[PDB]
Amino acid sequence: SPFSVKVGLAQMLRGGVIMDVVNAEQARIAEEAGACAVMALERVPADIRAQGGVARMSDPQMIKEIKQAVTIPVMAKARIGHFVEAQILEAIGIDYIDESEVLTLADEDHHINKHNFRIPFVCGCRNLGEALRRIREGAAMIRTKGEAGTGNIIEAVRHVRSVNGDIRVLRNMDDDEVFTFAKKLAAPYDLVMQTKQLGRLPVVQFAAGGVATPADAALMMQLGCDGVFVGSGIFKSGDPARRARAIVQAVTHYSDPEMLVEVSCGLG
Amino acid sequence: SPFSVKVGLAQMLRGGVIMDVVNAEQARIAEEAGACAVMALERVPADIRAQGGVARMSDPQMIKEIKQAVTIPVMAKARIGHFVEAQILEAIGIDYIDESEVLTLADEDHHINKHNFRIPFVCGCRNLGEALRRIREGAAMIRTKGEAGTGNIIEAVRHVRSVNGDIRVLRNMDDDEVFTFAKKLAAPYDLVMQTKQLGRLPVVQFAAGGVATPADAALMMQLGCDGVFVGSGIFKSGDPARRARAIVQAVTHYSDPEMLVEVSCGLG
Amino acid sequence: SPFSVKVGLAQMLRGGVIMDVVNAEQARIAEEAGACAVMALERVPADIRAQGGVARMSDPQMIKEIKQAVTIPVMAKARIGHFVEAQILEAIGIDYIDESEVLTLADEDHHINKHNFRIPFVCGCRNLGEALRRIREGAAMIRTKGEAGTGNIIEAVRHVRSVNGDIRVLRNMDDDEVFTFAKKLAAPYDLVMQTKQLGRLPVVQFAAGGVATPADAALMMQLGCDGVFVGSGIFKSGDPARRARAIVQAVTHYSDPEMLVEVSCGLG
Amino acid sequence: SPFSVKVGLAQMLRGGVIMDVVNAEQARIAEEAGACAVMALERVPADIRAQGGVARMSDPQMIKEIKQAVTIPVMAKARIGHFVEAQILEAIGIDYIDESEVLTLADEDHHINKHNFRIPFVCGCRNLGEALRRIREGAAMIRTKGEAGTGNIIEAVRHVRSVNGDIRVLRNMDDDEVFTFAKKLAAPYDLVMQTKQLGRLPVVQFAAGGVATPADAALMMQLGCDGVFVGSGIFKSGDPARRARAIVQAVTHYSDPEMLVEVSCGLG
Amino acid sequence: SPFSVKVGLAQMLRGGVIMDVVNAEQARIAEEAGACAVMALERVPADIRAQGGVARMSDPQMIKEIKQAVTIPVMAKARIGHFVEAQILEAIGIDYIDESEVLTLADEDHHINKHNFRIPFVCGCRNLGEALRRIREGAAMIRTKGEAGTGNIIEAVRHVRSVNGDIRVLRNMDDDEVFTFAKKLAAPYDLVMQTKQLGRLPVVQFAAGGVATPADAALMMQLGCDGVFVGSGIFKSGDPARRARAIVQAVTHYSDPEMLVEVSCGLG
């Protein structure tokens, strides 16, 4: 299928960090720091909503600027259910669309049908049922919804633990009981059974929302994530290159405390 | 698959009437009247529950007596979730097991995993979501839950209309909206989409529970059922052979009022 | 249209009394007493429900017996929503079908589509909205739901007053306000506007349920009904011929107190 | 009828964009950009209500100025239920009256009787029942109520999906069930049945309220609208001519992502 | 009676506009513009209450100034239940007292006994029952309570429609039912029956509260009012003479759209 191609595409991000960037300068710092992809963002949606505005797809022009500035994959956000925003993003020729709850919802009841696109989608989830629903709709990659722009990892920890815990429950579960389990999750039975066989999520699972420090990033990796997303927080500080490198280093060496000491020492 | 074989098996019952019988005499009357199958029943579960007892699988001996007495397929009831009752019934070599809510529930949370058997199962449903869940569990044939032993068709009409109505809703529905629809039904998405393509249920759909008269049986057929189940009510009356024939005739000639007049004239 | 033909058919009953009969003897007494039609009834539905049973269409045989016994029109009851019962009744060749809430409901959500039949239907109503809904479905004649087999006129008076009162409200109403009025009635606007122009119901309106005495029958006529239905109560008394005649006489001479004295004097 | 003439009048706007304008300068920009009509507006009602004022019909003088400045049809708003505002607008000789919930309600219980006018009316709706009610009152054209002056498309998407979804439900629905369906919609049965036969709304259906970007406009068209309304937002920006052209282009080429990229590139 | 004399006095205002004036200059503009009476007002009660003060009878001196300045009748407000304020107003020799809910209530439970005065009273009402109660107390003229100093006609429309609608209901109503109707209105039966015979209110019925534009004034007249009250809004604008004349012209020519266009064109 093209689906498995998209899934495979997403797997090459495993082990990596993805950074929110608002311009080409930041994008290069990200790339040099060793980010595996960048997320293009006209403005931080936190700030647009804090001022009571609607947060939409970013201007294609500014996305084009970032796509040119770097050789690593570029991602951008479409509003949930806004399949035309996604068509535009596909046509600009970015690598991944993030169907993002951080932007203003466009459809209260329906997500984008992501199978109708040739490029892979990221979606958020709070639990396994939601993850499996996004995947069936054609998401090639899952992140935690976490908590947008607070710096608080508590929500991301809840989500990772929730998802991973249900997968562990599912792995050992009497097969006869999986029907009821699928009902309670309101998830497609066929994806539930596949998740059972795999013993993990059929797609790459990243942590997102709240990851603020190297320690946070490493925690996410130790809890069994495949990678992390980081916000614009990195670039709103001193030596952005250093803070960027630190989080990449944390994710690469997530089980080496000595390394984590080094990258955290003197960050502010 | 063996699944499609079981589904195909069940199609031979299309256009037919299935009658509850409590002995071999009744079974022969049923067969001669033109019933397409019989349902073997130690005792009427209505009466066992009315006297506050538990209603279980029938004695294999009495089932064996009925299997011998007739050449039409024989069905018997297993309690919901009682997979060992089903194993016994399979080994006796009956034709269809009815996983029946009319018997005392054995498992509050789980139905039998019907895929683990080589003979086909009937299950009940009140709506499409329930039907699709029973099918995914491996039911080869669906009936309405209706209302056991009241003679009141109202519940069966509700169920037929409910199921058929949702199928019609599903047939025309924007494909992008079917994901959410599957969530709301708590039904496997893949079976929902298949039902959409077929424009009907993937399995034979019978009416059951409350069908008392020729008019009732014909109504069910006109509402789009593939056949009907009838209770032991038939044999608690004056000329059981006549009443039996009448319901068969009603189902065969369900769109011929003239015929329905004839079979109803002078029944009591 | 055939609709207007059915409406016209029903208008021939204007000024008349319709009597429930359970056999041919009673039917002839009814006819000779001057009833404009008879309602065939295997058994009184009151008694079938009082014993917790289901009340359905009557046996066509006993209906045939009554159709033969008399030259006045014969009516019979179909369960609400039971369109096959109605097909049978049509094919027997009776004159009017009563879609009757006195029988056990067959469809909780839908009435018979009465346009699909060539013979006229009676329906019950409690108010104008309900009346207009039954008419749009193709009822040619409206009766009050009243109160089955209590002998208590209070419900019938409520219904007549309700319907007539809303018609009077409608007759004078600002045309610009009729849209909202139709919304509140949940009735088809086109039938509402027609009722406004006519200043009465587009169909014959009879009183039913609770009419026990000559005084009751005359009251209904004075309140603006076109005729009345009477139950089997008549025949559960002395000189049924006398009691029958009395109600007919009451309806014919409903504004002549002297007559009403005469027919009521010495009845019980 | 004059009704079908008004419906036909409105159909000429199919495929088009209608823009809110507050003066003649803006009106010409709209016309040159390729708008199919303009909506004349003294002031943005959002601002009048935000300052706690009453929003009424616009001054006829300023409407006259805009009618002269352009050759495309002119629309103006009357308060709901304010039939005299509508008479004035008709007499000024504008092309379409919008009975608009964006203005201060004049009649809590009744809309204008739009049949009493010779020029066509637009009304808003949230669902099919409301649409069919406005049409029966004589609206020649339906728009979504959406959400006035937020730039948030979510309400408009809900409304389109709602209306279109119920039409799809209605298209396939058992005819016998349409009576109850009309009751639940509180909509005229005759218009419900007509909508069933047509398989779409008897009138042009436009999207309105929240449409902010080319992507939004195209989404509405992809969801099956016949055209869109846009607010004064367009003219509160740089090169208003460019932003205006962009939305027109988006609606014309709503299924061409490449086009949508071009018109969205560099908009701000 | 003196009552019918007062009623007749009030009828000579039929067809007219009454304007709130706060000085003699405004009073003359009103008179020249063709107002049929003026309402003397020390200060706008809206402003006295907006500043948390009590709004009472106006200073007799300022009322005397207005009575001298014009030859048209002068009205003034007394607080509800404040019969001594009314005695003072009578003694000053004004023409009409308005027992006004716009002023601070003086008696929570009782209105002025208006029969004890030789000059006619105006009272407000929201519905027919309230109107009939005020009349029995001796009001010679009824206005809607509407909504003081908002410019919003919605409340006045509600009241007119309410009153007129109940009168229409009453006109056609079965006489036998009028007793209960009077109970539900908590209105004197004798005035209810009189209103029934007349087919309208026994006294002049004016619209008041919210009438802001010519269109508003004409709407009130088209809904069946006998005249309108207008607030000080007129004089808080440009060319007060023009705006004054416009509303008078609107009420005189309330069914001529062309006229309404002319008087509304260029008002602001």
Author numbering:
A (entry chain A), B (entry chain D), C (entry chain C), D (entry chain B), E (entry chain A): 22 to 289
Quote what the paper states about this structure:
Vortexing with a Hampton Seed Bead was carried out for a total of 180 s by alternating between 30 s of vortexing and 30 s on ice followed by storage at −20°C. Batch crystallization involved a 1:1:1 mixture of 12 mg ml−1 Pdx1, seed (105–107 ml−1) and mother liquor. A popular strategy is to fragment crystals to make seeds to control crystal growth. Seeds effectively bypass nucleation, acting as nuclei to instantly initiate growth such that protein is shared throughout crystal growth. Lysozyme and Pdx1 crystals were concentrated by settling and applied to sheet-on-sheet (SOS) chips. Serial synchrotron crystallography (SSX) data for lysozyme and Pdx1 crystals grown in batch and within microfluidic droplets were collected on the new ID29 beamline at the European Synchrotron Radiation Facility (ESRF, France) using a 2 × 4 µm (V × H) beam of 11.56 keV X-rays, with a 90 µs pulse and 231.25 Hz repetition rate, and a 20 µm step movement between images. A JUNGFRAU 4M detector with a sample-to-detector distance of 175 mm (1.8 Å in the corner) was used to collect diffraction patterns.
Using Arabidopsis thaliana Pdx1, an enzyme involved in vitamin B6 biosynthesis, and lysozyme, we demonstrate crystal scaling to suitable dimensions and numbers for time-resolved serial crystallography. Here, we report the use of droplet miniaturization for the controlled production of uniform crystals, providing an avenue for controlled substrate addition and synchronous reaction initiation. The approach was evaluated using two enzymatic systems, yielding 3 µm crystals of lysozyme and 2 µm crystals of Pdx1, an Arabidopsis enzyme involved in vitamin B6 biosynthesis. The method was demonstrated with lysozyme and Pdx1, with crystals grown in droplets producing equivalent (if not better) diffraction data quality to those produced under batch conditions.
